[PDB]
Amino acid sequence: ASNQVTLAFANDAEISAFGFCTASEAVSYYSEAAASGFMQCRFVSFDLADTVEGLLPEDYVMVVVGTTKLSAYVDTFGSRPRNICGWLLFSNCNYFLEELELTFGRRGGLEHHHHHH
């Protein structure tokens, strides 16, 4: 229902994208994109990373994780969380549509010390 979003799954030989300098800027842009139905974004599965153009590892994007139920939060493109699914990227590439149930939240910047997770 409310957490079910229709997403444009990237389906294109090349995926040109841009990301964000800061987490807060990414949070703003993804929030507006969500309110507008996410047509500004593409779900890019993590195995398609080598086809993405325009992003560097330090760029902030929306990462999607989960082996079953899905979570999404802002983090760097280079991050490799447990059970990464891929990303929502700002891109105009060709697509097909699928609905995902997605919980959007915040994960970054909660730890001062280093830990093994």
Side-chain angles (χ1 to χ4, degrees):
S2 190
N3 281 99
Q4 188 158 229
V5 291
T6 303
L7 296 174
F9 278 40
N11 195 34
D12 216 344
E14 170 58 48
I15 304 170
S16 186
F18 65 85
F20 303 93
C21 188
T22 64
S24 60
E25 169 177 283
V27 166
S28 293
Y29 274 75
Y30 284 105
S31 176
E32 193 285 327
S36 292
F38 268 127
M39 285 84 77
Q40 293 296 72
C41 302
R42 300 288 181 267
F43 173 65
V44 177
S45 56
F46 78 104
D47 58 339
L48 298 173
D50 61 341
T51 70
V52 178
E53 181 276 331
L55 301 186
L56 291 178
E58 60 263 42
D59 293 347
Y60 288 90
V61 298
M62 182 74 71
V63 65
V64 179
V65 300
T67 48
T68 56
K69 300 294 208 69
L70 299 175
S71 303
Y73 56 91
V74 167
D75 211 340
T76 61
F77 185 48
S79 293
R80 290 301 184 266
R82 171 184 77 113
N83 304 333
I84 188 175
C85 294
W87 308 272
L88 302 185
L89 301 183
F90 280 80
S91 173
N92 302 345
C93 71
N94 276 5
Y95 64 87
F96 56 78
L97 297 169
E98 287 281 347
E99 307 182 8
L100 292 181
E101 185 172 45
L102 248 189
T103 292
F104 289 94
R106 177 237 162 103
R107 271 272 325 160
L110 295 173
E111 299 174 12
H112 291 256
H113 321 295
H114 184 261
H115 311 281
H116 173 77
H117 305 89

